[PDB]
């Protein structure tokens, strides 16, 4: 029995609904979790939630600082997001300086790994790139490969693929695997001829990351060069919107669909392993409808960010509770962040584990073309970050 | 016709005197400019200066933000510094958001060049690394060179040398000159062999930037490879530390001095073209006096940072004055900042010109050994950024 609590949380995400983690898309997930917690917290407890546009940029820092300056120093008890890499860094640094706990289903980059100082109050609830980099290391040791070409698009802006493959590069480095690096701006004028030439010039195994379309083009030029007959083993990373297989990620209703289908026979796509549960089903629907009667169409199964933010709420609540029960308050930010680490709980989609560094363990799947004639793609193997073992599907 | 104006100023530089632009080394120069100014503006007009430690990092942002949040939501009137690249970006962004004028003798990186949005309220009073790049370009056209090797140390922290050669890269790339890139962390064990061999592989002209001792070492190994004496042209950048660009740069009162001396016959050092005047003499005297009275073993004199901050203040007044005329206040940062751009004024050492983009034009000199026997190093040529002309000496 304790006095009701009033929790102020600042949600910093992009208002623009083109990103998979926009406020419009995540909010439903947050409200679902919030409703499901009340009946761990003293009865009568309530949550004050402020939704602020991050613009996937400097605005995250801009509104956080302005809100605190207006409140004459008053700070939120919990900050959710940003997701975008360059937007989360400054927010994470202030949250730490202020002892405010910060959870995000983004901030996937390597740099956030170091939480001894600068990023101590940051808990990543979605699987970081470095984790995806450990999976690839397992995939590689399993095929006994020891060299790889890293081909990726670099925005010089958001730089998602740069950060994605940095996660692989960081792991391969420590381990000893050799790596060739090659980048291009997929936005600027594309030159698929130089791409493929560098490829064949360096390593026989290629790990790529760029838009699904851009990869398709690279695979066509590769095919048109005879690199798909089985002389190269291509890989691409689509951790958040890998649902094209089932119909054919090569299929574009394009006049190149035939080429593509054949080209993709030497291509494998790494994505997140998504597990289901009855709860997930109902949660998916509501979130889907809320979004629908809002103006946005949503992929059947909600994405990792939306799911991740639901679990962030639960996670925060699970930590605040244990903090309270020990005499401390919601204002002991560091103490709350510590309760969120090295612990396993039940998220909306199933179990969720967060390592001793405050970074979620991620599970991945590998999709490959199982029948070249039809063009059937299927998960041939999965990896389980916590268990640390990769295994092809029986 | 005007009341005693009162300017609240925030200076953010490092407390640590390890830096050439530390609060102790700069504060005197700031104070000097504040006398000849409080002695253009209405009588009584005073400057309240807060000298805060930037720690060449996150501290700059923490202090700026804690200051504005603690005391109401009141922002200082002027911000001087940070100098450090990773420290200035966050302050410049906030300054542009709060419409506060920011002047620095630093923030030299290539990214601060784009002031259409985030860096709109930033005016750099010292030559940016890009100005240095335009200088090499002319140096290159003069000799008909068209390809170079960029060799620099990247500590993955302050990255001064990386940002330095990034300035040469940007200009070379937009112009057409090819460039081999090679980097290492002089913070680790120097494989001064792969370097010298990668060098011997890439190009004939080598642009370098690393600690003074490091360039000395590299230049030795190269010597051991007979790479000096007309075969290759080695350049190293030392824009600020008088100790590193002073005659006899090879000499270290050591065993290598004889060998070292022979390598540098092929080495050319790039630095800033400094000009002085009688008034500059008093300045140097008073500054030295304060610094010495401050127990700091007086370096040798006033560097580009100490000088630049002094001229930053006269530059701020020269703009306040004209903003205070057209009917504006000390709160129209945007307006102030625009009055600092595209203009020439009289600094403590001579004419100072800030270009249309708010960046100080830079003049450089090239230091080469004009007597291998003796070791006599003297300025061979000068480049004047405003005029854009490079010219050897008689």
């Amino acid at each position: 029995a304790l006095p009701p609590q009033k929790i102020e949380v600042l949600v910093l995400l992009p208002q623009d609904d083109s990103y998979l983690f926009s406020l419009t898309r995540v909010r439903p997930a947050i409200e679902y979790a919030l409703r499901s917690v009340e009946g761990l917290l003293p009865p009568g407890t309530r949550f004050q939630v402020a939704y602020e546009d991050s613009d996937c940029g400097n605005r995250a820092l801009f509104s956080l600082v302005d809100r605190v300056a207006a409140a004459r120093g008053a700070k939120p008890d919990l900050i959710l997001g940003p997701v975008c890499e360059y937007a989360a860094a400054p927010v994470a640094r202030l949250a730490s300086h202020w002892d405010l706990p910060m959870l995000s289903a983004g901030a996937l980059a390597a740099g956030f790994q170091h939480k001894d100082s600068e990023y101590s109050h940051l808990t990543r609830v979605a699987p970081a790139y470095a984790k995806m980099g450990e999976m690839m290391l397992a995939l590689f040791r399993h095929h006994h490969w020891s060299r790889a070409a890293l081909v990726y698009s670099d925005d010089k802006l958001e730089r998602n693929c740069y950060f994605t493959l940095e996660g692989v590069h960081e792991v391969f480095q420590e381990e000893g695997l050799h790596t060739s690096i090659y980048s291009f701006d997929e936005t600027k004028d594309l030159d698929l001829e130089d791409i493929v030439r560098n490829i064949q010039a360096s390593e026989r195994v290629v790990i790529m990351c760029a838009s699904s379309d851009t990869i398709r083009s690279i695979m066509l030029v590769a095919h048109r060069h005879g690199m798909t007959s089985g002389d190269y083993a291509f890989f691409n990373i689509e951790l958040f919107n890998s649902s094209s297989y089932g119909d054919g990620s090569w299929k574009r209703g394009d006049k190149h669909d035939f080429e593509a289908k054949q080209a993709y026979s030497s291509l494998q796509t790494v994505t997140l392993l998504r597990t289901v549960k009855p709860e997930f089903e109902k949660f998916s629907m509501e979130v889907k409808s809320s979004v629908e009667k809002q103006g946005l169409n949503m992929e059947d199964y909600v994405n990792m960010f939306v799911e991740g933010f639901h679990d962030a709420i639960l996670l925060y609540v699970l930590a605040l509770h244990e903090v309270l029960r020990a005499g401390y308050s919601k204002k002991d930010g560091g103490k709350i962040i510590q309760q969120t680490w090295n612990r396993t709980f039940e998220g909306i989609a199933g179990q969720v584990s967060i390592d001793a560094n405050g970074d979620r363990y991620g599970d991945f799947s590998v999709i490959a073309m199982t029948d070249v004639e039809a063009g059937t793609q299927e998960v041939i193997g999965d990896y389980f970050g916590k268990e640390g073992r990769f295994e092809m599907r029986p | 016709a005007l009341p005693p104006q009162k300017i609240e100023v925030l200076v953010l530089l490092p407390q640590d005197d390890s830096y050439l632009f530390s609060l102790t080394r700069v504060r005197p120069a700031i104070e000097y400019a504040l006398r000849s100014v409080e002695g253009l503006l209405p009588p009584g007009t005073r400057f309240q200066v807060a000298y805060e430690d930037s720690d060449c990092g996150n501290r700059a942002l923490f202090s700026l933000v804690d200051r504005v949040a603690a005391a109401r939501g009141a922002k200082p009137d002027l911000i001087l510094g940070p100098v450090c690249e990773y420290a200035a970006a966050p302050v410049a962004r906030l300054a542009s958001h709060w419409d506060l004028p920011m002047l620095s003798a630093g923030a030299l990186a290539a990214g601060f060049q784009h002031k259409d949005s985030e860096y709109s309220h930033l005016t750099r009073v010292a030559p940016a690394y890009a100005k240095m790049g335009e200088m090499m370009l002319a140096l290159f056209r003069h000799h008909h060179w068209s390809r170079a090797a960029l060799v620099y140390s990247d500590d993955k922290l302050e990255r001064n040398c990386y940002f330095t050669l990034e300035g040469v890269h940007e200009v070379f790339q937009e112009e057409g000159l090819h460039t081999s890139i090679y980097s290492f962390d002089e913070t680790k064990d120097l494989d001064l062999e792969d370097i010298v061999r990668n060098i011997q592989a890439s190009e004939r002209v080598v642009i370098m930037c690393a600690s003074s001792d490091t360039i000395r070492s590299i230049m030795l190994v190269a010597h051991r490879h007979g790479m000096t004496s007309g075969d290759y042209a080695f350049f190293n950048i030392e824009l600020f530390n008088s100790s590193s660009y002073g005659d006899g740069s090879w000499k270290r009162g050591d065993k290598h001095d004889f060998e070292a001396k022979q390598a540098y016959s092929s080495l050319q050092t790039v630095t800033l073209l400094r000009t002085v005047k009688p008034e500059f003499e008093k300045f140097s005297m008073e500054v030295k006096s304060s610094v010495e009275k401050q127990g700091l073993n007086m370096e040798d004199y006033v560097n580009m940072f100490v000088e630049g901050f002094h001229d930053a203040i006269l530059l701020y007044v020269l703009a306040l004055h004209e903003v205070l005329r057209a009917g504006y206040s000390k709160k129209d940062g945007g307006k102030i900042i625009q009055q600092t751009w595209n203009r020439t004024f009289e600094g403590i050492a001579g004419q100072v010109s800030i270009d249309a983009n708010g960046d100080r034009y830079g003049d450089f000199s090239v230091i080469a050994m004009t007597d291998v026997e003796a070791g006599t190093q003297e300025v061979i040529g000068d480049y004047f950024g405003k005029e854009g002309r490079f010219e050897m000496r008689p």
Binding site: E85, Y86, A87, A88, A89, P90, A92, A109, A110, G111, F112, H114, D154, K156, L157, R159, Y162, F163, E166, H169, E170, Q173, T179, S180, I181, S183 | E85, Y86, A89, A109, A110, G111, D154, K156, L157, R159, Y162, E166, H169, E170, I181, Y182, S183, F184, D185, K188, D194
Partner: peptide, 21 residues
């Protein structure tokens, strides 16, 4: 390689030029 030993300063600005050994 265009990554170097690290990149520590991720989320800073530094996105205008590679590296490599």
């Amino acid at each position: 390689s265009c990554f170097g030993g690290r990149m520590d300063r991720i989320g800073a600005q530094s996105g205008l030029g590679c590296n490599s050994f």
